[model samples]
Target: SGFRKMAFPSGKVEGCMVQVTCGTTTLNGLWLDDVVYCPRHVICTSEDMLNPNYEDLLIRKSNHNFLVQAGNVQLRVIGHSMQNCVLKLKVDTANPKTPKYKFVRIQPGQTFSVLACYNGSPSGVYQCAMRPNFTIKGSFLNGSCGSVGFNIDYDCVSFCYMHHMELPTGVHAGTDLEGNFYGPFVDRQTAQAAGTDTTITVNVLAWLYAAVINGDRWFLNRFTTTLNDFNLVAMKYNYEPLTQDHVDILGPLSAQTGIAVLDMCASLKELLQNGMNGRTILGSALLEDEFTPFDVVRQCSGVTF
Candidate 1:
């Protein structure tokens, strides 16, 4: 029946943890040291485990909707199709048939992004529809389009409001005032005084990306520390780590950041695999460097090194 009833301690349950055992395997919802015993994908994200149809829901849906906080959202489509397909977006539903943005005839693998703020507007419903061409062939004399299959992956940064004083470059920011957009502002004073309430929304990853690309390790270190604190608090509360959406946003940045990230993670992996004996100067460096960026990236991407 694949059912088992277990007993637990009835005492104070504060900070109590549960472990599930099936046959000789134990499931603790934590990353294991060995890949053999537990493959990476088998480890479930909190969202996936909580939502029974999480996987199926994605597979079955053709139209996807997203609420972007303040940053740009990227969409990717990949699959096999007999005929050309198009990805359409409706930023303003006022004209249902009109699409604010349309991708080039989608190839097997394609990606496109749109800023959350359009025409200086901050918040609105953005709808995406995947239109696949179908061709019917075989015995049919009139050759028609066949079936098409594809998957769409989207990622977005959470909406956050920051003072103009704290505004950073590389973020897609918009003003509270209508028809006003000032991102990557020419002058801080001008930007601050132009808007009534100089509150700005930023794309955090974009900011981080700019910092990394521009050799601004100072800001990167600070950003990493912030993520470290977030992970620490999340763990304490038994909350879900960042989701794949964050990973998607970070994917290009990770690639652009070069091999340093991979090198650090490799050292961390060796130390983890060999246990206490594997500790070295590099391992110590990882701690001193506050392995937060690596840890956060790994957690979000669900990649083991």
Candidate 2:
């Protein structure tokens, strides 16, 4: 077998599996799931290759056309007649060949496999064709190097799809501070209208019923939460002066390399030119010294004033 390794991103090279051919026969493993990593060549007795003759029970027979489930992938030789043959195996590539080819002599009833490594983006059913030939001195057998041809079918795709979770959708609600709002006004009518009209009693009950169904308290809470979150985000845009946390992050970074905060700010000015403001470099009209743009971060957590 021509065992050459391909390095996968998984960081290890788990050796290579290649196909070797024999005259008029391609030997693959009978039950291999990952045939891509399977070696082409099997050595089993004639009894292993033979199917049950008479009165066989269910699931108790040797398979000819086997399916590759997930991993073990090997092209198997099925027929009984051509078990004992002298086979010369070579990769059927238009490109040049190396030591990846070999020749093997098999006995009667022994199994053999052929290997075919296809190109990338593998999925869906793929049909693979192979031919058996032998090389002797300068003359060849099986009609001379690639003579008797064969084919097999394999299914590589999943039959169904699996679902995963993400953010909820199709829910449209109000998009403002109340998400829907009115205000905090005193209702003097609740006290005075109590005795004014007896019909007012029914009207108050209706209004209360509507408020309960509409989730008035829920809407008000949403507005309050939104306002708080917005103010927190708005603080990011305010651009405050450097404090301990800002200096803490930048200090270690600046010390590790010879680049100081002043140097970093200067580089930023050179990169952005006029697009970045002088405030970006921490030049405040109010007091405070020894600060640079690199010494500041936009979070409000640890800043004083």
Candidate 3:
């Protein structure tokens, strides 16, 4: 009644979850979720999809993935169902579907840029509605994809924010050469989040937080302790799991495959032309993500970008 495999990136073609429609039948609405990799090496995983009833349960994968963005991107819409072509974007109300982050959209023949914005954070009992309609598709929302996880890692964010980690939001991911910063959602002064998780994991958030602090969203910096919620989506931004930082973007930044992952259109344009000034790429990602354009990332344990 189901298939299983390893985990994969959210938007990457090499994903493990595949909804194969049986046209129209008992298996019609029945979609197949293919797990390309193991869900987790230690954490327990379920093998059946139909057994879960999908009430709040979804097609869970096995392996916790870490994607590598060492190339370009290509997209093709799948169905006529509004649900099919419609993508579930992780937006922060401040800027929704804007060219603040680095993602290209190809609808029919139209090509466009996309980014996740946040007007603010969300609390309990919320209704996401699209004006004039009941369907909850287009609406204002908030949250950082980097802060995603299978389950909320209160301890991680708690330590970073509680200790009074002041990261300039305007600098995108609030990164610098010191450390990183995130939080202030429902409980701005606290380490609590009012929003919910639909596509992110804790491990994903921590990894992205690391990237933000390092100011290099396109890094593959791996941590010593296992990252918490590492799914396919946030993993898409994981380019290379490094051991330390060189603070030298010339080597890492210089090597690129002329593709797109996450960056502002304008800044990426500049980056492609004269190349980034180490910090330029950070702005590109922040601008593209619809976040405050500022220097957020700091230093790293083992990385160079």
Candidate 4:
């Protein structure tokens, strides 16, 4: 029912599947695989509040006792029948050989949520319990034994661990024929004042051309394809100003904006201040080599050395 649109990284967007187990008895439960899609952030729920016609078959059949298993998922106890009704959550580690369980009791009038990023354990097992000697008219369901009912909200996302890429070391120091010092700067103001001259755009262009001349087809093709895809999306978004938050959400390789030239200079300055050599900007320095002619590199990068 209450589906919310969530923005995902540009390109292919897919759903995450969760395993659900439920039964009337606590010992044994039935198993089912459920697919939760992107855009709609809330993957699973006990009941469709907006549409009473829809209900989670497992939860409805099991009378709200169920175990959910998924990788990279978050669970929140949204609502309960009464203040006396408490929701119990039992989570276990993904270690199949030696699994450990933890418990969390969520009471009404309190905020409770859990994040499970483990590989494949019973991320959460939910059940409702009541306070001692508490009486109620109706069960969690329309007609049942106890008066404890609860609704849960779930959010899932695909997880990818991006290991750090090694970059080039040492500053690129040199003096022009005019005896002007043009090297890495300690601050952005100095770097900006030096403008694109102190930056490494030309160096990066040279690296790419060297990859092309050396027939490093794999890296060149990947770089070109990725750049094209990123540019396509950037144009689709009207080349809006890109922020670090936007870059973080869009993933690393897809970092681009309307002002790519200025963005590169800014990033180069930051990297230089942070102890990175100004030989090349971006992570492209990892693929640097000596192959392209200086004249060709200058021509392509629209700069002269």
Best by TM-score: 1
C-alpha lDDT of candidate 1 relative to the true structure: 0.24
Lowest lDDT block of 10, candidate 4: 159-168
lDDT (0 to 1) per candidate: 0.24, 0.21, 0.20, 0.24
Q: What's the TM-score of each model vs. the native? A: 0.20, 0.15, 0.15, 0.19
Badly placed stretches (over 4 Å) of model 2 are: 1-247, 275-305
Which digits, one per residue and each the tens of the lDDT, describe model 3 over residues 106-131?
11111111122211111112111111
Model 2, global lDDT: 0.21
User: Roughly what TM-score does model 1 have, to 2 decimal places?
Assistant: 0.20
Q: Give candidate 4 regions above 4 Å deviation.
A: 1-18, 21-47, 51-64, 68-89, 92-237, 242-260, 263-305
Give a tens-digit lDDT track for model 1, residues 116-143. Answer: 2211122212211111111101111111
